[PDB]
Enzyme design. Structure first.
Site, PDB file in Angstrom:
ATOM      1  N   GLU A  76      -8.296   4.936   7.574  1.00  0.00           N
ATOM      2  CA  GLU A  76      -8.786   4.300   6.359  1.00  0.00           C
ATOM      3  C   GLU A  76      -8.816   2.789   6.646  1.00  0.00           C
ATOM      4  OE1 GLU A  76      -8.120   2.157   3.589  1.00  0.00           O
ATOM      5  OE2 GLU A  76     -10.109   2.881   2.966  1.00  0.00           O
ATOM      6  N   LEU A  90       0.857  -1.189   0.000  1.00  0.00           N
ATOM      7  CA  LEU A  90       0.000   0.000   0.000  1.00  0.00           C
ATOM      8  C   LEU A  90       0.908   1.259   0.000  1.00  0.00           C
ATOM      9  CD1 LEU A  90      -2.709  -0.987   2.785  1.00  0.00           C
ATOM     10  CD2 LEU A  90      -2.791  -1.440   0.319  1.00  0.00           C
TER      11      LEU A  90
END
Ligand SMILES: NC(=O)C1=CN([C@@H]2O[C@H](COP(=O)(O)OP(=O)(O)OC[C@H]3O[C@@H](n4cnc5c(N)ncnc54)[C@H](OP(=O)(O)O)[C@@H]3O)[C@@H](O)[C@H]2O)C=CC1
Ligand SMILES: COc1cc(-c2cc(C)cc(C)c2)cc([C@@H](C)C#Cc2c(C)nc(N)nc2N)c1
Length: 225
Positions: free
Chosen positions: A30, A23
């Site tokens: 999030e 990521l």
């Protein structure tokens, strides 16, 4: 019969989702959204499924996999067939498509799965445009002083907006009833696109929780016997 929902965090405007197997950001808020949405159910006797590609599995920290409180399914073309238990909490499949058909069997599932979330990565999402009923997309934007991160993997936005429309007005209603979100619904222009959903800020980014739903289809054929 059970909804199939792709869920993804993507950086606007190219919808980059990854770099070098990881990521491109570390955003605890999030991640808490992803955790709550995929874990929580409306019906307490059910769980959700999370389906992921082998490379995505390999990137989840070992301490944290399989993802707790959800049925985890890992797909690899080197696996045995279409849905096999391999350890507690872990199913292996050699086919994204046949896996979904298998998970939909009421006989196999005893109607105890709520939703099936497809949780990545790039290659899985590419194949999911014609399989998902909805997309939960977190649209991420660098704040004015923030360096845009480098990225190597992207959501197929063309095919997205082909098949789905921005249904973010209904996001609150779509999420499991117990979730609590900090934003109010909010439509903002950002580099020439309309960004609508529930705002957060964290570290150098602003992001919006959004919902995409399949466009209406014409009635061309229904199969008759
Ligand atoms: N921002 C976000 O919300 C997320 C981003 N990501 C990002 O995505 C990137 C990883 O994506 P990507 O490399 O495409 O890898 P994937 O996670 O999509 O895994 C790809 C692998 O899945 C298997 N596979 C693909 N299609 C099928 C199929 N139809 N049937 C059976 N197996 C299949 C193959 O495994 P095999 O080779 O063993 O046969 C293939 O190599 C990373 O950068 C990661 O950070 C990942 C999740 C979420
Ligand atoms: C590539 O490496 C990955 C690492 C993790 C991961 C990393 C840490 C530090 C802890 C845990 C429990 C998991 C998760 C994922 C995957 C499975 C994901 C995701 C996802 C997110 C965060 N948000 C939205 N909106 N949708 C998504 N599908 C991929």
């Amino acid at each position: 019969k059970v909804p199939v929902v792709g869920i993804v965090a993507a950086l606007l405007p190219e919808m980059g989702i990854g770099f070098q197997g990881n990521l491109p950001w570390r955003l605890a808020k999030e991640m808490k959204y992803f955790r709550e949405v995929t874990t929580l159910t409306n019906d307490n006797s059910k769980q959700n499924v999370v389906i992921m590609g082998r490379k995505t599995w390999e990137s989840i920290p070992q301490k944290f996999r399989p993802l707790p409180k959800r049925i985890n399914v890992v797909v690899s073309r080197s696996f045995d067939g279409e849905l096999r238990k391999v350890e507690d909490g872990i199913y292996h499949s050699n086919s994204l498509r046949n896996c979904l058909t298998a998970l939909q069997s009421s006989l196999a599932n005893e109607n105890k799965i709520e939703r099936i979330y497809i949780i990545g990565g790039g290659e899985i999402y590419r194949q999911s445009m014609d399989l998902a009923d909805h997309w939960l997309i977190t649209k991420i934007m660098p704040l004015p002083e923030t360096t845009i991160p480098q990225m190597d993997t992207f959501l197929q936005k063309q095919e997205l907006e082909q098949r789905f429309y921005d249904n973010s007005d209904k996001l609150v209603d779509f999420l499991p009833s117990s979730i609590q979100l900090e934003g109010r619904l909010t439509s903002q222009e950002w580099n020439g696109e309309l960004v609508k959903g529930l705002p957060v800020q964290e570290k150098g980014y602003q992001f919006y929780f959004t919902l995409y739903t399949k466009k209406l289809e014409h009635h061309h054929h229904h199969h008759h016997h």
